[PDB]
């Protein structure tokens, strides 16, 4: 259908970072469409995971859903944190993303940012109340997932 090809091209443009094509194709129907043949990601999940800051900014200003979950329960903030994209993470939080959201495995954005060792994202999340003591379904807190070698991030999450 007209909508399906356009949804596909929008998802592709969001992944590619092509903001002019995103603007061209963004409709109420497409803006939060799901990638049915993949993991049910929205355009925002793609823009966030692939570090497409201008596209994130456009999407957020035209009603994209910061809280949308992919098939694993990931929200766009999870993709930003797991792939280490700070500006995207900041934008999402500024537009209401919940830093304590949990996926189906009970991993939060801080579990992801802690494992990845991204200081600025860990700081952003902690300043907005991310819990460094919250256990996922492995029994691991974000502090537990800090790589054993990564002393600087360990110190940051300890806080106190």
């Amino acid at each position: 259908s007209g909508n399906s090809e356009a949804d596909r091209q929008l998802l592709e443009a969001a992944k590619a970072g092509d903001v002019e094509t995103v603007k061209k194709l963004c409709t109420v129907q497409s803006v939060n469409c799901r990638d049915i043949e993949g993991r049910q990601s929205t355009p925002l999940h793609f823009a966030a995971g692939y570090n497409r800051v201008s596209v994130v900014e456009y999407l957020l200003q035209h009603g994209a859903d910061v809280h949308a979950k992919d098939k694993g329960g990931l929200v766009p903030l999870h993709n930003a944190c797991s792939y280490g994209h700070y500006e995207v993470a900041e934008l999402l939080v500024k537009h209401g993303a919940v830093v304590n959201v949990a996926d189906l495995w009970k991993f939060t954005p801080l579990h992801e940012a802690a494992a990845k060792g991204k200081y600025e994202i860990c700081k952003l999340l902690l300043q907005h109340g991310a819990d460094p003591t919250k256990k996922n379904r492995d029994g691991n807190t974000p502090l537990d997932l800090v790589k054993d070698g990564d002393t600087d991030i360990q110190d940051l999450l300890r806080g106190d």
Binding site: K15, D35, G38, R39, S41, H45, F46, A48, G49, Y50, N51, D70, G72, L74, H78, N79, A80, S82, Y83, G84, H85, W105, F107
Partner: peptide
């Protein structure tokens, strides 16, 4: 647990 869509 498979990764979300994106790349480092």
């Amino acid at each position: 647990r498979e990764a979300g869509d994106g790349a480092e």
